[PDB]
C-alpha cells in the first residue's frame with residue numbers, strides 16, 4: 001500500500017517548495033538532511049501530522065543555493081545545519097523583558113549572548129542579511145530564539161561554548177551596514193615623527209586597548225618599530241556609536257558618561273559576563289536578574305558610547 005503526503009521544503013522559511021514524500025521512506029532518503037523547526041528529522045519517516053508542514057533542507061540545487069545565499073549571505077556548507085542545531089536549543093531558552101529590553105535567562109553559557117543582545121538594542125545598527133533583519137526584528141519584540149541561533153551560526157559557536165563579547169560584536173558588525181563610519185587617527189613618536197591613519201566600517205567603530213573614549217581623544221601609548229613608545233589620539237570620528245575594548249580590568253563607570261558596557265568575571269577558560277546600562281541610574285542586567293546602583297566599579301571589558309560627529313580640538 002503506497003502512502004504519501006504533501007510537505008514544503010525551504011531554506012529561508014519564506015519561499016516554499018511543494019514536495020510529495022513517500023511515507024515508507026525517511027526524509028533523508030528523499031531530501032538529504034531535513035529539519036522541522038530545528039529538529040533533525042533526517043532519519044525519521046513521515047508522519048500523518050506532517051502534511052502541510054514546512055521542513056528546512058540543505059541547498060541541493062541551484063534554486064535553493066541562490067535563495068540561501070540571498071537570505072543568509074553565506075555559502076558555508078555547514079551553516080544551515082549549525083543554525084538548526086542551535087535553534088533546537090535557543091527555542092527552549094527564555095527571553096524576559098528586563099527594563100524594557102529583551103534579555104536571555106541564563107543557560108548554556110549564554111551570558112555573552114545576552115549582553116550582546118542587550119547592547120544591540122541600545123545602539124543604532126542595521127543588518128544586511130535578511131535573515132538577521134527579520135530575526136532581529138522578532139528579538140526586539142521578545143522572540144529571540146532565531147536571532148540567537150543565527151548569532152551562534154555566524155560566529156561558529158555551538159550552544160554551551162564559552163564566547164567572547166568583543167569577538168561576537170565583530171561578527172555582527174561584519175554583517176551590518178557601517179559603510180558610513182569613518183575614523184581618523186594620528187600617532188606621534190619623537191624619533192619617527194608622525195603618521196595619520198584612516199579607518200572605515202567595522203575598524204572605524206572598534207578599538208582595542210583602552211575603555212575610555214576621553215583617553216582615546218587625548219592620547220594613549222603604543223609600541224613603535226624604533227623601540228620608543230608613541231602616542232595615539234583620535235582626530236575625527238563619524239559613527240552613531242563607538243565600542244572601546246580592553247583586557248578586563250577594574251574600572252569605574254559613571255552614570256551618564258556612556259551608553260552600556262560589559263563586565264567579565266573569571267578566567268579565559270570560564271567566567272561570566274554581565275551587562276551595565278546607564279539610564280535614569282545604573283542598571284546591571286545579568287540575564288533575567290536586575291540590580292541598580294548610583295555608582296559602579298568592576299572588571300569591564302567593553303564600553304559603548306554614543307556618537308554622531310567628533311573633530312579633535314588638538315592642533
Ligand SMILES: COc1cc(/C=N/NC(N)=S)cc(OC)c1O
Pocket residue numbers: 058059060064065066068069072074075076077078079080081
Ligand atoms: C550547501 O550548504 C549551504 C549552502 C548555502 C548557499 N549556497 N549557495 C551557493 N553555493 S551559490 C548556504 C547555506 O546555509 C545558508 C548552506 O548550509
Ligand SMILES: [Cl-]
Pocket residue numbers: 125126127128132133136
Ligand atoms: Cl536590522
Ligand SMILES: [Zn+2]
Pocket residue numbers: 189190191192193224225226227228
Ligand atoms: Zn619611532
